C-alpha cells in the first residue's frame, strides 16, 4: 500500500541525443509495392494513364501535396512542366513509308517504326532509363514506358530497362535512398529528409542520407567536398595559406591515423583485463568499464576529427574563440583520460567514472549548434 504509486513520482534538456535520427531499411520488393501504391493513388486522384502519372511524379520528387495543389492551380502548366504535353518522308532515315508504319508522340513529329525501334535500343545499351526523348530537335517530350516496351525486341533487354527505371525512381524519391555499398539490394526510408547518420542493417555501411558520403556531423555536405578535393605579397599569402593548412592538417591526420589504433588499443585493453582476471584480483564484471571508456575516447576523437574542417571556414569572431577554447579543453580531457586508462598500473573506479562523465559532457558541448 505504501509502494503503489512510485513509478509516477520522479527531462528534455540533456536527455535527448542531439544526433538521433530514425530510419528503416527496405528491400526491392517493398519498394516496388510502395511505388505502385503511390502510382495508383495519384493516377486516380488526377485521372491519367499510369505512365503519365509516373512521368509527373519523377519531375516533382514524388510529393503528393505539391503536385495536387499545382494541378488545381493550373493543370495545363502542370502537364507542360512534366514534359508530357507540348508547349503551345522520315527526317531520321530519309525514305518513304506507308502511313500504317508511322508512330508519333504528343508533339506530332512523325518518324517511322524502324528508327524508333533502333534508337531506344541504342540508348538503353548506353545505360539510361528516363533520358529517352523525341528524335526531332528542340522538343523535350519524354516517352512513357508503355511506348517503349513494344519497341524493344528481345527479353535480355527489357529487363535492364526496368532496373534503370527502378534506380532513377528511387533516386528521385525524396524519402528513399540507395545503399552505396557494392552489390547491396537495400533501400533506406525516412519520414523526413535531413542530413544525419544512416546505417545499413545488412552490410553495416555508415553514410549520410543526402550526400551518400561518409558521415560528417558538424559540417555541411558541400563544405566537406571541396576540402576532400583540396586534400612578394602574394608569396606571403601563399605561405600563410599553406601554414594554416598544415596547422589544421596535422590534427586531421593525427586522428585519421588514430582510427586504426582504436582496435589496437582494444587489443591491449583486452590483454590487461585478461591479465588482472587471471591473477585473481577480481572477476570479469569488475573490469568492464575500460572498454566503455575506450569506445567513448574513440567517439570523441572522431567528433574532434570532423570539427577542424568546420573551424577552418568560420569568419573571425567571438564564436571562433569560444569554439577553439572548447576544443582545447576537450583535447586536454582526452589526453588525461587516455593517460589514466592506457599508461597506468592502478585504477580507481570512482575517479574514472567521474572523468568519463566530464569527458562526455565536454564532447556534447561542441555540438550545441548542430
Amino acid at each position: 500500500d505504501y509502494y503503489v504509486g512510485v513509478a509516477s513520482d520522479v527531462q528534455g534538456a540533456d536527455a535527448f541525443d542531439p544526433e538521433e535520427y530514425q530510419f528503416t531499411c527496405l528491400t526491392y520488393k517493398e519498394s516496388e509495392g510502395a511505388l505502385n501504391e503511390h502510382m495508383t493513388s495519384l493516377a486516380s486522384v488526377l485521372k491519367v494513364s499510369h505512365s503519365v502519372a509516373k512521368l509527373i511524379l519523377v519531375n516533382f520528387h514524388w510529393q503528393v501535396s505539391e503536385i495536387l495543389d499545382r494541378y488545381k492551380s493550373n493543370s495545363a502548366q502542370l502537364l507542360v512542366e512534366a514534359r508530357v504535353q507540348p508547349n503551345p518522308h522520315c527526317a531520321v532515315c530519309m525514305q518513304f513509308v506507308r502511313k500504317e508504319n508511322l508512330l508519333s508522340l504528343a508533339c506530332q513529329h512523325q518518324f517511322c517504326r524502324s528508327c524508333w525501334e533502333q534508337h531506344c535500343s541504342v540508348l538503353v545499351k548506353d545505360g539510361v532509363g528516363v533520358g529517352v526523348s523525341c528524335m526531332a530537335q528542340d522538343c523535350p517530350l519524354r516517352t512513357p514506358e508503355d511506348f517503349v516496351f513494344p519497341l524493344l525486341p528481345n527479353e535480355e533487354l527489357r529487363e535492364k530497362y526496368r532496373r534503370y527505371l527502378f534506380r532513377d525512381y528511387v533516386e528521385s524519391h525524396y524519402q528513399l535512398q540507395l545503399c552505396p555499398g557494392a552489390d547491396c539490394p537495400m533501400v533506406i526510408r525516412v519520414q523526413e529528409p535531413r542530413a544525419r547518420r544512416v546505417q545499413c542493417n545488412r552490410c553495416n555501411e555508415v553514410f549520410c542520407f543526402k550526400c551518400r558520403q561518409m558521415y560528417h556531423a558538424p559540417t555541411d555536405c558541400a563544405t566537406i567536398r571541396k576540402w576532400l578535393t583540396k586534400c612578394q605579397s602574394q608569396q606571403a599569402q601563399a605561405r600563410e595559406a599553406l601554414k594554416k593548412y598544415l596547422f589544421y592538417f596535422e590534427r586531421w591526420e593525427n586522428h585519421n591515423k588514430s582510427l586504426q589504433l582504436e582496435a589496437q588499443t582494444y587489443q591491449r585493453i583486452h590483454e590487461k583485463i585478461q591479465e588482472r582476471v587471471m591473477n585473481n584480483l577480481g572477476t570479469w564484471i569488475d573490469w568492464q568499464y575500460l572498454q566503455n571508456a575506450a569506445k567513448l575516447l574513440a567517439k570523441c576523437r572522431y567528433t574532434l576529427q570532423y570539427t577542424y574542417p568546420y573551424a577552418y571556414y568560420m569568419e573571425s569572431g567571438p564564436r571562433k574563440k569560444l569554439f577553439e577554447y572548447q576544443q582545447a579543453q576537450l583535447e586536454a580531457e582526452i589526453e588525461n583520460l587516455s593517460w589514466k586508462v592506457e599508461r597506468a598500473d592502478s585504477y580507481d573506479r570512482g575517479d574514472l567514472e567521474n572523468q568519463m562523465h566530464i569527458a562526455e559532457q565536454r564532447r556534447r558541448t561542441l555540438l550545441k549548434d548542430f
Binding site: A91, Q118, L123, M135, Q137, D138
Partner: protein, 142 residues
C-alpha cells in the same frame, strides 16, 4: 544497321550544293566511317585547316566526335583537338540533325569565339590584343 543510307544521301547532298564557306572535302579513299575536313571561315581569316570527323556506327543515333589536327589558338579548343560542340554534344544531341547543320555550326563557332583554355578565357575578360595580335601571328605562322 542504318549507318549507310544516311551517309550516302548526305554525301550526295553536300556534293550537289558546293558551298563557298566550305571549300572541298575528300572521302579518304572509300572509308565510309570517317573522313577529313577543310574549313575556310570568312582573326582566323587566313588559313586552310584540317578537321578529323569521327562517325561511329549508327551515325544518326550517336554523336559524331569532333577534333582538330592542326593546332590553333581559340578559347573553346583544347591543346590538340579536344573541342566541345554543344550541338553535337552528348546531352544536347538529337538523331535528326544532319552533317550540314553541324558543319555550319562549326563554321559559326570558328567565326567568333565563346567566352576550354581557362587562361584564354581570363584574357578574354579584357582581350583586344591577346585575341587580335598573337592569334594573327600564330595563324600566319601555320
Amino acid at each position: 544497321v542504318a549507318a549507310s543510307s544516311r551517309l550516302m544521301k548526305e554525301l550526295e547532298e553536300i556534293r550537289k550544293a558546293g558551298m563557298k564557306n566550305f571549300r572541298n572535302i575528300q572521302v579518304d579513299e572509300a572509308n565510309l566511317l570517317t573522313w577529313q575536313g577543310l574549313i575556310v571561315p570568312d582573326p582566323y581569316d587566313k588559313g586552310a585547316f584540317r578537321i578529323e570527323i569521327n562517325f561511329p556506327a549508327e551515325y544518326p543515333f550517336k554523336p559524331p566526335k569532333i577534333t582538330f589536327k592542326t593546332k590553333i589558338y581559340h578559347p573553346n579548343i583544347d591543346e590538340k583537338g579536344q573541342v566541345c560542340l554543344p550541338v553535337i554534344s552528348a546531352e544536347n544531341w538529337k538523331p535528326a540533325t544532319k552533317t550540314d547543320q553541324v558543319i555550319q555550326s562549326l563554321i559559326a563557332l570558328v567565326n567568333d569565339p565563346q567566352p576550354l583554355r581557362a587562361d584564354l578565357a581570363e584574357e578574354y575578360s579584357k582581350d583586344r590584343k591577346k585575341f587580335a595580335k598573337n592569334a594573327e601571328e600564330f595563324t600566319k605562322k601555320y
